[PDB]
């Protein structure tokens, strides 16, 4: 587990968070639907609810 506590000497701000997250195009039998993007390995790496 990484612990990146906020430090004044670290000005390396992040912009990927500000930019909106991507989406995915998956088509089922009925129609083409749009779902939020998840990394192929994010299901077992996602932030756990528990």
């Amino acid at each position: 587990p990484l612990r990146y506590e906020p430090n004044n000497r670290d000005f390396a701000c992040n912009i990927i968070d500000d930019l909106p997250k991507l989406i995915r195009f998956v088509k089922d039998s009925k129609r083409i639907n749009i779902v939020p993007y998840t990394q192929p390995n994010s299901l077992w790496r996602g932030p756990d609810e528990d």
Partner: protein, 51 residues
């Protein structure tokens, strides 16, 4: 002679692309006073009872 009003610099989730477009297309088609009332009178339950 310039009553320059102070613009309220209000400021959180970023959400996704599809949600933002759905929200805008959906929107395409007293409250403060009540808040003040909750602050004008406090420390008791008199106002709810009289209502």
């Amino acid at each position: 002679c310039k009553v320059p009003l102070a613009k309220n610099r209000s400021s959180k989730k970023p959400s996704d692309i599809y949600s933002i477009l759905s929200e805008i297309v959906k929107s395409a088609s007293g409250r403060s006073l009540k808040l003040n009332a909750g602050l004008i009178f406090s420390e008791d339950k008199r106002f709810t009872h009289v209502v």
